[PDB]
Design a binder for this molecule. Structure first.
Ligand SMILES: [Fe+3]
Ligand SMILES: [Fe+3]
Lengths: 298, 132, 298, 132
């Protein structure tokens, strides 16, 4: 019944592995996990923990192969098992969804002219589970329900920044019209700048990244006009994942308060970003410090 | 609006092969092969005899040779997509950073140090015709 | 690169079974097949045979089960196998597609803000092959390429008539931007009025059906405003398939010329409808008779 | 725009049960079981012993009985969808006309005569509260 906060976060596999192999506290990973600590401590606080999390991420050729490629999909199943992506199933708890809210949202988006693909059975890869591990740690069960929302950014063309932004506003409407008074979150996961392929792999554009976060907060409507080619050219071929952050942003009102922001280079092949946004109207107090930028180059 | 204009600019980005419909169609067998490595059973069989396993996927000799040589740049040239191919290097026990670094020509160590230092700068690698 | 004509037709399985059991000439089916003769002859004429047919239909829980429900899908596969719907695969040739044009339309539609689901492997059920059998007979191989275009009308809600209408125009734009000078057709299949379920099964509304045909030709814009509830009320719960007709209609200009129209009651549980529309500008000469209505009740 | 208002209206149509999310969720198992009959081997197994077959699908006692009793009205009440269920009467060798008529309480002969005569008139069976 209410989208109280928007959170963005990285979901690269290397983070789940640091945890798995118990190296999340070494010289390399330590600064990264430390940067998530404030989010961890914030979300646990009473009234900050969500009932349902609508997790926007892109399937990494896990649940969808080359035979079926949906632009937008929504998981309306009861349970979602962690996918086996080559190393065996990720050793984390099964993701429990919320069929009632999920189906309600799905019906609303179609009536609102978004050509949704409803999924009643699908495995969730690192794109969905790594963010849960980063923010909720290693519980025996996730502390809330999760509605997986896979977006295609693998096979071109992915949806436009303008479409994603609009979809975000549609989700907020469907959530607000849901009878139960749930505390709902929208997480935009992926990014930031990075390139995994070819001679240009290793590309990082901190200028692009920081500017993106900046405009995402104050001028999302203008940011949603940014064409695909600009993401690719500037942030790397895989940096295009950032379009998904616009879905989260669009679910929030015009005025938002950024309670916390973390930016770090490098995290495997990427520049890592994570933040907490809440509508100015009901926002809480920002954290101290409000912004943190780690990495040898920062 | 101009689907042709849209795809045409993807051509001006240096060292980058965007996964367009053209590449997806060409690498369909290679990507579906990689997908099969998600099932442990397939992983083990493939590992037992890669060549015999690959032969069941009707790949082009170029695509098969690329897989056998673990040449990711070549694999991408044959239509392979990095996220589908992650199943293959994950089967080998390699990280995403190893795969990425292997396509740059630098030694694994040089690539790692570069990332620590801030990664590859976009300067000079945004436009082929522009040279910037 | 050209959408020359729009055709609509029934796609009920009974027509396919009639052909199979050689009962297509009996007292019951003869009138029906007699009505398609003019179409079979017209299309086969020199220059009427299309190069490609974008066949719009609804999967009848064949290619899609309860686990994946796409609103709009497009088959970009090179070949499609007839589905086994309980009797074994339909004994008709394999459907050959047009990947070049298929992928072209797919990309254009997504850029045009339609959340397409690309299918690279899918069996085509009776909704797709029956119309083929009705217009092309029993060839050893279909005379042209076919691009399957499944639309969800089984699980609610199905797309809106307005969305369907807008989609057709987008398909035409996409076809028109294809570099090759192809003769493309857009067939809208399904309908007309009927109810397969409950105490109300058997319902037929010739008034509604006849009005639908009329408005679809003269005022599709108003027709695309008709809400789901009206189809369900007046044309039976299964008569909602008619919305798919707006997709075919939207791909044709404002001024079209109806070359042929056949309406017959009954055809199994339904009221059968079939017609050939063409842009007024390049429309051929209407057929003689141009309009026909069969059925003991007509 | 209002999903609740949209859905509420379908309740005013007599002798009709629109396949909405609520029904889809209830008949998930029954509809998936029906889908399984698209395979010739599954059909043979189902035919061999129907009851045993149904036990592997976790249907509710009501749904299971409805299937074994081939009561399509009862099956739709349990969340089944006519298009999914067509797989069941198809393996039984029956047509769509058979299934539809069987749900009207009319005899196969009368139902056929009715269709020949123009089908069931909408007059009086459109609105429950409006009586038309
Ligand atoms: Fe990702
Ligand atoms: Fe149909």
């Amino acid at each position: 019944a209410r989208v109280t906060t928007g959170i963005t976060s990285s979901h690269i596999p290397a983070l789940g592995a640091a945890i798995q192999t118990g190296t999340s506290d070494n010289d390399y990973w330590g600064p990264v996990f430390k940067g998530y600590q404030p989010i961890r401590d914030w979300i646990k606080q009473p009234g900050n923990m969500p009932d349902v999390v609508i997790l926007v991420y892109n399937d990494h050729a896990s649940a969808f192969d080359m035979n079926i490629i949906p632009t937008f999909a929504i998981g309306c199943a009861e349970t979602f098992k962690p996918a086996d992506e080559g190393w065996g199933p990720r050793p984390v708890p099964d993701v429990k969804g919320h069929p009632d809210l999920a189906w309600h949202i799905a019906q609303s988006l179609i009536l609102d002219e978004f050509d949704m693909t409803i999924m009643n059975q699908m495995d969730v890869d690192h794109g969905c589970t790594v963010p849960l591990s980063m923010i909720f740690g290693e519980p025996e069960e996730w502390p809330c329900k999760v509605i997986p929302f896979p977006v295609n950014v693998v096979t071109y063309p992915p949806p436009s920044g303008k479409r994603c932004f609009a979809l975000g506003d549609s989700i907020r409407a469907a959530v607000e019209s849901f009878p139960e008074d749930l505390n709902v979150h929208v997480w935009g996961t992926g990014g930031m700048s990075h390139q995994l392929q070819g001679p240009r792999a290793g590309l990082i554009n901190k200028e692009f990244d920081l500017n993106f976060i900046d405009k995402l907060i104050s001028d999302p409507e203008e940011l949603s006009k940014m064409p695909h080619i600009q993401y690719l050219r500037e942030s790397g071929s895989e940096g295009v994942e950032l379009v998904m952050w616009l879905i989260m942003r669009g679910a929030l009102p015009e005025k938002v308060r950024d309670l916390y922001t973390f930016y770090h280079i490098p995290a495997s092949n990427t520049a890592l970003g994570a933040m907490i946004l809440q509508p100015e109207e009901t926002a809480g107090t920002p954290l101290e410090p409000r912004k943190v930028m780690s990495g040898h180059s920062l | 609006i101009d689907v042709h204009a849209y795809l045409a600019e993807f051509d001006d980005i240096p060292g980058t092969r965007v996964f367009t419909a053209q590449r997806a169609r060409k690498g369909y067998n290679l990507n579906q092969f990689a997908m099969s490595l998600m099932k442990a059973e397939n992983r083990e069989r493939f590992k037992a005899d890669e060549s015999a396993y690959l032969d069941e996927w009707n790949l082009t000799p170029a695509a098969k040779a690329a897989v056998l040589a673990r040449d990711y740049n070549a694999m991408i040239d044959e239509g392979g997509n990095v996220y589908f191919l992650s199943k293959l290097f994950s089967t080998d026990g390699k990280s995403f950073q190893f795969a990425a670094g292997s396509m740059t020509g630098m030694t694994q160590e040089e690539y790692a140090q570069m990332m620590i230092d801030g990664g590859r700068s976009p300067a000079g690698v945004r436009s082929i015709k522009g040279g910037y």
